[PDB]
Nucleic acid binder design. Sequence first.
RNA 1: GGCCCGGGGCGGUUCGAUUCCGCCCUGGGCCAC
Length: 437
Amino acid sequence: MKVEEILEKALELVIPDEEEVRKGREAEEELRRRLDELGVEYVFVGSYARNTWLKGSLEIDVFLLFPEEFSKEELRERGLEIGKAVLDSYEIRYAEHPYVHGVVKGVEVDVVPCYKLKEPKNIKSAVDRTPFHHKWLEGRIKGKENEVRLLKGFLKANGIYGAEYKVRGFSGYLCELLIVFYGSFLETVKNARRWTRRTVIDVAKGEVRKGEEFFVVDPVDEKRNVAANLSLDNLARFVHLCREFMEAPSLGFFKPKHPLEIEPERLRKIVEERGTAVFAVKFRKPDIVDDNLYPQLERASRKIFEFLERENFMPLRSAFKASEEFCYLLFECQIKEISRVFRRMGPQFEDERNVKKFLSRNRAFRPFIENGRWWAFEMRKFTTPEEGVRSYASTHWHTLGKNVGESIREYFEIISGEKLFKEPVTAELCEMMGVKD
RNA sequence: GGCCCGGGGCGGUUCGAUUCCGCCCUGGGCCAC
């Protein structure tokens, strides 16, 4: 029931069993043949190549090596041809550049094209840095693969594994660098506890120093931060998870948390107990990829949150959720209703010039003096958050992200009350309000 | 697509805007890569 005892049973969840392992080898096997039969220069990389892949995440990455002189276009065309010829089923995919994804003997395969080079410089695209990352890692990580898996399993179970924008967590490469640095998962966890937002980990120099931000310097490129897209709050959650784990080790830290859905009735009661304004902006989800969508949801969410705060509705927290169908921007405010009149600060009494201009405005209530300066009562255009966001979203749709904003412009509604509790957002709402149990 | 930084125009808002809320062009860096 102590750390060691737990990490033992935890392996069971992160390490792939013989059947899954065999499936991958027989696949790498066949994949090899097909490529040699065309005599292509390739190099398996990624977690499959180093046996650092998490149980259930089997996927083979194959990078095709091309001469430095070949053209951008050449690589994609030939990469496509090759990928086409070797994959049972395929499907052009995209990221920095287009690439081929498919399945061989029942397993996911990625066929990426890149430039065969030597020495980190000369690099043209992040895909070229992958072989170097791989080289630096194969020798150093050998023998610690299960330590890598515990860390990945740990981060994954707590919703902070991937480095894509939907997650903003720890990339797999980062996890392997951490193991190489600390030696094991427990050592990584024990030290992470003393991590700060100013911590800088330098694998190449085997050093830990203070910086302006959390920086895990790439062994292959001292200027690149591997934890660049790890978010401040996600770094905080990890640090806090590590402290709690070392305090009360549990297998539970490696098991995915249950959705724990709730009945809209209890949710309705909670919001009533809160006395707050809970509402959502619902619009149609743009047909774009997560990497473009979620950063936009954050912006749209932030822009409106700041509108709510400068408009005095005392926002608490925000959230958002995407579906195949729609997107929801969720909000909770302390002010369900603010008055019509508010006070605008005017000039100091001595400034005759500005005072006259300030008093020249025809207002409904007659301005007054208070502690040396003039003030005026003014009337608002809206008195409820919902009412405010309807105005805001309607005229500032263009500042809520290029795609999200264009979608909001053509359609969006504001839901609240029971009507909201029926939408697919209860999970996000409970998280947002700290509903426990 | 998003984030950081820096320019040239603008609009609305305000007693007063470089500085609030936004929009055009526009140069550089970063991120998912």
